[PDB]
Design a protein around this ligand. Structure first.
Ligand SMILES: [Mn+2]
Ligand SMILES: [Mn+2]
Ligand SMILES: [Mn+2]
Ligand SMILES: [Mn+2]
Ligand SMILES: [Mn+2]
Ligand SMILES: [Mn+2]
Ligand SMILES: [Mn+2]
Ligand SMILES: [Mn+2]
Ligand SMILES: [Mn+2]
Ligand SMILES: [Mn+2]
Ligand SMILES: [Mn+2]
Ligand SMILES: [Mn+2]
Lengths: 183, 183, 183, 183, 183, 183
């Protein structure tokens, strides 16, 4: 059905991205960022999107540049994939937990970008992943997607659980919005 | 489908209300209060109700009497159309964003009226519509409706957005509650 | 020279914007919001932009929708105008007083939208204009324009003064950024 | 160039002044207040004005009378020199440091007098110059001048450095404002 | 044009630095510190300096010794290149954004060294680069450069952004001060 | 007797004002601002001045420009009426109540502009009149008038009473100051 394909090439990065909204949950990501792939594999698995990401970047500097241009790419792919937005639910709201974590995501494929981020992560790094990037990821994805997106933390100690549960609750909500409403 | 109709006159106002719970979203409000029409036009447009309102009132004094009497009629009209309540969900739950605002609405078509209203609207006026009247509209609605309704502000700065996001949220939660569940 | 043009027709509004970055100071704005027109003439007179707005919207409900759609147009007109963005300054920075008022605007034409708004206006209305719409004007303008924009209140009592000083500093920095850098 | 000339004679003082907006840097000031001459020399040197001041007053009493009248004359001759204020930038904004001091100066040759003075000088006397008189010089300069002026201390420990940096940033921004703009 | 060159060899590092004040933005750094190279390309890119750096040091202990010997060299390369300092602006002042961040950077090539540094970086590492070394870099660069330099943070969450914004504003203000004034 | 006339035309207003310092209390104000007319009527009546105002302004936008330009015209009209200021009290000082309110005006015809304004008016509008304009009227009057005016709210709840009592007190002390002293 609905597939979005973007190939962006900056000085800093090389990003190839393919999203099927009406997928079966196929996860095939290789960004050079081990933890970000794991989050994108959740995105596929939990909202049954098919996600094909393939990137190569400044990883020697920071993770910052690659994190960002993948995120911007995914949002542009999301926009092309929704087409003219004919009869989709459009809104989606799901609270998913992971053990002690409990994350709430409400969103709306509005056309006007906004990221409400209320998410305190107590450690500065999960694996090698700078933990400030999760915010940056979602910001960049929202800015090209045109997606109004609030994310709210109700509970959580463990930083791995917190980001995983967020991506779990973002996927299930995103599907809810991409699916077709019997209008 | 399921339709409730109410004529209702007093010394102060004259009010007439036709509501289709199984409509297509035909918004048809002319109350003498431009702002309230707009919110009633979102009730229809998001809940897929057909909403017909016609009214004249003491607007030259206050919007108070007309906002209250319309609200009272709509709840009475909602009550008739629901009729026997045969096999409906009864409960609706929906959080809705409109940019920075984020409003949760939980309801239960119970028979016992309750408004839990937790909404701080920073400005006294949106257009020419007294901002205190958003609480009096849902309070009057609930009173004739036999509805149990909680409205909770989670986020919000701008007044238009907040009120509108409540009406968006409430409409999709009313729809959910009036629909038939494979019981 | 560099001219962006935008027509835009939504259910609510009918907007027609035309902006010349290399103008002479031509203000020709009639939107049906008298206050916004006066501000859009500060934009022209101080940025030496030629500005031509023409709009009709739901003024009877609110100024909100008309405010919003003009802003989204002005921001789009800007992005057509800039085109390739070759050999321009890219960064603006100007602090501007108007009597007791003092407003710092810093901007970067980056292709990534951000609003930093630290402006407490002590009255709900100047003329008939809802004061919350000043923020929504720059927010919506930024959202299509692709502009990183910080606005900073350093001083101000009079609400007319604060908004006017804002459009003065914005305009002069918009100029600094849009002009050619001897590269 | 543009030359202001003002000879004014109270009971208390005999002031003579000649400023040249389009000067070259010609420091020529004797006032009977050695520190103020050191500040007037910085005004000519950093703004590239040709400043000429010659004064006598009740110095045996206080530096007050003489400080005020010189300030009142410099303002007036600034005005006479501007004339019709045709084609000039008009606005000036500059932040100059001196060692640990850092003072920001925004002004506007506006026709309307105003002084915001946010400047804590920790000592009561630099040499023999009463430290309260710095405020009084820019206050009196501003009334006759019709200038809008904000002086903001962002850093500073040493009293000499604070005042001199204030005279440096005043100078450089005043230049900006008197300079022609290609309209 | 104005070129400074420096080879500085210690028991710890071998540092080679050529700087071109009147360049076209030539970036060319390999210091063994990936993030410092990125900040150097930003300096070369935004001041239109040409920046050639080559370094080998204790990167296996710390990044500290390399960080400091490189920046001490760069200050010295700046000082040779500047010469007698004839008819340059001397004062450079610029506030620059990078998304949520906003750093103001006022300086004066005075001959007397000073660093007012008011920057709170919320993480301890960008990439593998100690976040404390940013201050020490600007501190060393100031000591031999004979420069007066204030760096004020007005906003910022993301560390990468904060520092890159510091380097963007440092660059555009150094440009301003080394450029020639029509005197 | 002592008569001051002024015609002043801007791009926003057309103001004509005449004031007789030795009048008999004749009130002749049509300003486009019904509340300020009422305040000038008190100004004549309570100081026995003959006040003639006829104005035309942006009133569709704001009352701002019209309020300011009338204020500035009265001050120039006052300065002229006074001429060479020979044999007159110079200093006035009156405290006038209006019911619960109590204002203390204490002026000085100093040729030196200052306003002390220590008034807290608890509502945003008296009629259609923006309450902020009271300060701005008096600020603008003082700037072109060369008067030293202190306004002290000692008591007051109702805003109509506070502004009217200010104009009462202000008039009785302007009258006192302009009267002659057996010299
Ligand atoms: Mn009543
Ligand atoms: Mn009631
Ligand atoms: Mn709306
Ligand atoms: Mn909006
Ligand atoms: Mn004295
Ligand atoms: Mn004095
Ligand atoms: Mn060290
Ligand atoms: Mn970034
Ligand atoms: Mn970077
Ligand atoms: Mn204005
Ligand atoms: Mn004004
Ligand atoms: Mn009265």
């Amino acid at each position: 059905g609905r597939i979005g394909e973007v190939k962006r090439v900056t000085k800093e990065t090389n990003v190839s991205v393919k999203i099927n909204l009406d997928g079966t949950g196929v996860a095939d990501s290789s960004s050079g960022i081990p933890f970000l792939d794991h989050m994108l594999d959740q995105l596929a698995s939990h909202g049954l999107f098919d996600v094909h990401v393939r990137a190569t970047g400044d990883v020697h500097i920071d993770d910052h540049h690659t994190n960002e241009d993948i995120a911007l790419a995914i949002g542009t792919a999301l926009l092309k994939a929704l087409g003219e937005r004919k009869g989709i639910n459009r809104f989606g709201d799901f609270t998913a937990p992971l053990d002690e974590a409990l994350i709430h995501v409400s969103l709306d494929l509005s056309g006007r970008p906004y990221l409400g981020y209320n998410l305190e992560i107590p450690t500065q790094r999960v694996g090698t992943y700078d933990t400030q990037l999760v915010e940056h990821f979602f910001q960049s994805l929202v800015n090209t997607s045109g997606m109004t997106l609030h994310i709210r933390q109700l509970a959580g100690e463990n930083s791995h659980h917190i980001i995983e549960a967020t991506f779990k609750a973002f996927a299930r909500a995103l599907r809810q919005a991409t699916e077709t409403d019997p209008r």
